[PDB]
Write a protein that binds this ligand. Sequence first.
Ligand SMILES: [Mg+2]
Ligand SMILES: [Zn+2]
Ligand SMILES: [Zn+2]
Lengths: 79, 98, 1336, 100
Amino acid sequence: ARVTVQDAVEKIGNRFDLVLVAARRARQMQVGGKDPLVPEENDKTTVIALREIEEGLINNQILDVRERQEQQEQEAAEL
Amino acid sequence: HARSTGSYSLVTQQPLGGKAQFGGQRFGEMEVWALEAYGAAYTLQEMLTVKSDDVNGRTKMYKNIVDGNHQMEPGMPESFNVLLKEIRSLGINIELED
Amino acid sequence: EFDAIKIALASPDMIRSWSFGEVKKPETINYRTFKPERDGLFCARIFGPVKDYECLCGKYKRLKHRGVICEKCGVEVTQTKVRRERMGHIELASPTAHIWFLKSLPSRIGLLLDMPLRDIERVLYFESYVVIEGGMTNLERQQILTEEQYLDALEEFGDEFDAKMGAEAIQALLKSMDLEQECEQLREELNETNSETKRKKLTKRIKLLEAFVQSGNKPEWMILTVLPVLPPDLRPLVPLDGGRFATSDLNDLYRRVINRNNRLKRLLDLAAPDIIVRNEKRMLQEAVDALLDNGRRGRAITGSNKRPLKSLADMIKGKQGRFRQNLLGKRVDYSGRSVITVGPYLRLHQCGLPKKMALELFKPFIYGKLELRGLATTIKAAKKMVEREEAVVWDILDEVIREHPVLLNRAPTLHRLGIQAFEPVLIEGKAIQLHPLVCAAYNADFDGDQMAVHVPLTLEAQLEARALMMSTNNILSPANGEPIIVPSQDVVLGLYYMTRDCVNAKGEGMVLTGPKEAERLYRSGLASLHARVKVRITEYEKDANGELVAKTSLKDTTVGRAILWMIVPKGLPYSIVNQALGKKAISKMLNTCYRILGLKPTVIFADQIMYTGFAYAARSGASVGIDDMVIPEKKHEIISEAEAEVAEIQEQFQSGLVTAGERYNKVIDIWAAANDRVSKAMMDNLQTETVINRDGQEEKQVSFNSIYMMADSGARGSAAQIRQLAGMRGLMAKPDGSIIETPITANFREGLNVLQYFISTHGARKGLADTALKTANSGYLTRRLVDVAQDLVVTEDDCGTHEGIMMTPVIEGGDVKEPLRDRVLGRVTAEDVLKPGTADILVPRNTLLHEQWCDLLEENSVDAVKVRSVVSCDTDFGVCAHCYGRDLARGHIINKGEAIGVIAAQSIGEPGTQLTSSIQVKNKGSIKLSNVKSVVNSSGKLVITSRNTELKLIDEFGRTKESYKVPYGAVLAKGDGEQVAGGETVANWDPHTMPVITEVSGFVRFTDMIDGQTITRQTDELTGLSSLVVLDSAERTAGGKDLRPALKIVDAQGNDVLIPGTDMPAQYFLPGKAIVQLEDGVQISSGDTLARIPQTGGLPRVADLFEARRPKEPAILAEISGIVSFGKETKGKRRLVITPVDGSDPYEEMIPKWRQLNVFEGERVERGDVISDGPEAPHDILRLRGVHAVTRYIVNEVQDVYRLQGVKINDKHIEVIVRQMLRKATIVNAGSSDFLEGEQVEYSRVKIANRELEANGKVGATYSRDLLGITKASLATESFISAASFQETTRVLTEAAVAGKRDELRGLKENVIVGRLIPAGTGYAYHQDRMRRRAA
Amino acid sequence: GDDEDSHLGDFIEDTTLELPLDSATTESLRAATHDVLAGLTAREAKVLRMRFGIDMNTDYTLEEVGKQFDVTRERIRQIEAKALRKLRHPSRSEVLRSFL
DNA sequence: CAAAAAGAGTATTGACTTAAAGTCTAACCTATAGGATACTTACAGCCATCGAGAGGGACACG
DNA sequence: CGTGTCCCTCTCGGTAAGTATCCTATAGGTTAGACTTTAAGTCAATACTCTTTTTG
Ligand SMILES: [Mg+2]
Ligand SMILES: [Zn+2]
Ligand SMILES: [Zn+2]
């Protein structure tokens, strides 16, 4: 669960980009194309996304790299 | 009192007054200033488009919520269209351009 | 989608393009079968079908026939929502003027033709003729005739002469004019005239003509020929239950228009006599002008309600128009109210939400979770499971509210802490439970208050509520960086009572082994909570590189302070809880935990304070009784002495020793002095009533009185609420404002009798009738502050500026009202703040001065620091992040994007409900002088020959402690550079004397002195001295008026004594009423006196400073520096001439003759220096002294109001409003730019226009900065939508239509109205992405 | 009311709108009748989509679909009747009964 | 494995009743015209009492 | 030919309940109701073919 989000802010700065990155990741995990990188503890996708932000396994560049890898995989699997 | 979805008004398709006709809470101008003083741009946008006035967006949002997807497709409020028609029914020609 | 909104006039062709048909009948529906009759206001073949995919007759009735048009009734088969979008039109039988473009005060029709509105209304009323291109034979073009004159002209000219009447004549005048020719003739005529008024009038008309040429509009489109009609579903005729209908007033207005238009067509087809036809045309012109704007021209038409029916323009304007009632704030789904209660068991990130309320707000979330689990087959089955409240829909409800915040909002939202996000806890009941610590932010007590909860739906609104609006993030105030979750009243009395010491309690003096033993003793009853003991505590100080270091010592403390030490976190010192711990000591205990430890330790610590303050206030058993109000035993003697001192001044009034205005002030002065003796006899009795024994002998101590402790700890009480319970209530004021002589010498423990309880109600209804309308003048000031600054946003990171503001401590004349630390904390330095050892700097030139950098400035005693300011930022359309500084409720710098213009207007407007001879040194320091000329007086001391001398007190540390203003002609009892002692008078002067003191010594000659014209015979009958007073201009003779009496200093050898430095004569022109005392031929000393010339609001004051109101008696400033002179007199205005040494000399001003001047015709005046005295206008400070001096004036004259009521507001928030006031500019030299001379262009627009030119080889235009009020800078903006939604919708839409204005949607109001992401916070990235792909 | 704030027009609601509870039931019925028709033969999943205008334009009568398949009018009435007969059976009608 | 017999699917013809139009008639609304002693200027809602500030237009004077 | 002053104007901060009005005669449009027609849904019997069963 969450009480304060200060660790996520000091990981991803500006306090407004954090909301966007966390919403992007939470939407990735919600419409279930993906599964969390962190052990979920009944946390919703918002809290799981923030916990992934805190530990540094998810940020904007990580999401962009994974998205580009997915786009390359789809093209290479088009046949 | 509590409301999620009920009856909407006639000219401006907005919820009605409190607890006699199952009406919503007024999110007035000072609350809009309070949400602008934070950075809550998405909360404000769902306050003034999907929760209140956009006719297609509120049905889409209800279907999304009951389908387990929390995503908004905002559109443009009906009150702005009413305002455009009322200004345009004077001699003045106001229009949206791109 | 769209990127801009464009507004203009509509051609008749455009109006016929919008329409789907012509409305030809006034009928609405059939009275028997309520179907829309054709073809009236409600027509199915014009405005669409009444039912979805059905014809009117019924031949086509399904979606298989979509788009087809019935051959019988003509109704298209489509959706019935097209009746909200399809318009019609009315073909008027005669042209009709548009009331907006005629009856607006500028009168675009009137000033486009250069024809006065009084002479146009005569033509529109069919009571005068006007020629229309009548040839160059006898009459002019726009010459007005009458019936007789037109008859004569017709009898004299049968052709080549056209003069019409009515709106046809006005339309012909508007159509026959050539705009380019008129504009060029006006431009030629502009240079010929030099009168300012003619220049302004011609410039206005040329501006209008250019606005008409540049846009696509035509002049004759301001006269209606085709009138559009609104879609029917926007003016409905819906039936109520009971057979009766409800209609809009637009139906009545349109029916009147159509009836009169049809009758006019009928009369024209009948060849009626012209009086009837003219009357019908006047009636039609009345009907249309009442439809567009009712009541503007003539009297308002009223309906059957006997009320003026609402027109088209009344649906857009006002507090209940479309803009303010339906676009800027709406009714919202997923919301509800309930009463709030305490629930003190909560954590400050969570609230208590009833199960009944949470079952309705989260209704769709439960419908979609029952089917996911398979508990319900369909949406209709899940709708009935929660309808009968099955036992499984409560287990589902706990899953949908786990990490889902809700927004709690209290009805007056004065600042942004009025909306906060909490995590709901499901409780059984009907009242919301609100954490005790967040009540100060909401300003909410529990005596009937209500709150509205709002449910964030989308996945981004649940992350803004958690990351931005959560209640654990808002613990500091955005107005001043101070805590806002301070413990309030019951927890601050439990921490005060626990942390106190009693002289001899249980278990005193015993040595404890730690805080855990002190609690084992108290709980088992072996020791008292106030027992002076020695405990061994281990405290951690993190003065290492972030590492905690332990230190163990044996502390002298009490049992209660050891028990509280188990709550305080690691890195805090033990002296934080080793005191009595009132209310201020608890608020700084949380502030020195946010700075040292951070946010997460403070949030946990703020709840443990609340839990341990509620717990030990209950164990206290602190009550209130009638014996706790201890009346002094001397109160009966203090009053009896004051009643025997008003009976001796009553006798002196009858004996004539004192007048009426003196015994009234000698009775108040002894009742206000006997009120300070009763209140000092109880407070010295209450505060130490406890005297107890130590070691046998008695010993006094601080009292444990139940009412003293509630006031000594700050727990809901003061020393003025007391002294009305145990002292006396003192002097009361009658409603006229006077103070009654005899006070009310009783209190609330003894009781007020009938006569003195009635008196204490004049001041009780007056105090209740003020707060009932102080909220209407404070809620309107904060609305104008938001709308002038809503568009300001941090849009950059560093603009690279070196300009700034010099910050100094505020010294009103006595104590320092605001030290340097408060005025400099969290601001970026503009230049290197070098230490007094100037060989090396102290801080760099871009350091954010936080708590640590403000310690060096205090140790080294820095006098002043120059910091970057918002008002001096190079960023165009926004503010740099370094020119703002600290985030102020975030400990870091401001984020790029943050909307600082709405934060700065709620911070000023929130405390608006709380708002309404000699010099004696105090400390021991050095006398300091600045901007003063020195000359020896007769007695050897120093007299001052300056007008703006400042007296200061420099202590040993080199910082200024006192600041006194020394007038002209004052004798200095000491000298500069000397270290004087406190209490010594270092300056003395006569306040009623304006000396003309000399500068040198010699003889005084009565040159140009005439007895009977200038001098009168005033012989002193007391001393015998000769008094020779000059006369004023209203009495002096005309032949002697042109003579200036002067005293040129000479000697006894026939030479001339002159002022050193230059060789000008030492002559002193004596003004009127100058008392020549010393006789001629007498040798004088230097600096000898010659003549002795005889001599706001709390809340409206803040409004007047921001509105830039000009004062009633402005002080005259000096327009240019140099040497002053004089000139010819006149009747009403005197003449003052200022001569530059090398510049243009003949500048002059018309000073009124009835104002006391301050320059003696020979002083070197400086630019922007006062000539007269009084309230100084804000505009003249900007023009003469610059930008940095008009912002210092406002932030120092508006913080005086707030500091008098104990309100802390940062100076960032006032300099943001000032920046939005000096936002326009006026061109002085057009240069190589495209700007007109008199045009008022925006400052940022003329700052980048002459930036490409200066980067190029050309030359840039120069400008003059302009200051405007908050209601004029918010109304002259580049957007007509952020200005029409504020005020004067009719006046803004009229100017934006005739100019073809285009709205780029750059602000925060435009995106709120049109329904998209504001470009401020989380939507700042979205708007930057759009500006990249747009113009890519 | 007892004030100049409330008006008669603020209490008149729009009765031409359909509730989103009713609007989300329609999108759930178009999916429930899509799986059911997929469980039938392609001939009976096409005559039922024509006898009732499902996911297309105007519905047809018995004769109008006779030309489509060259079958006579009477047999299609029986082909449709057997298609109706299959769907009444359980294990293909449980979810459908929740819509009544 | 292979042949005879019964049950069921698929496509027909001949009545046999049924809802949806198509049409004729009447009866009942609905729009229009006409009325000849002589009659000739309505009013009333600025029947109201707030203040406070800004802007423009007309008068008078230097 | 140009400032100062005063006056006028503009903008800002369940309801509702009455006033008399007449009257007569023609001709045409509108609807509504019942009779009749027609495309449409229905049932009863049936022949053929395929499948399925039963039997030695
Ligand atoms: Mg209250
Ligand atoms: Zn039709
Ligand atoms: Zn800057």
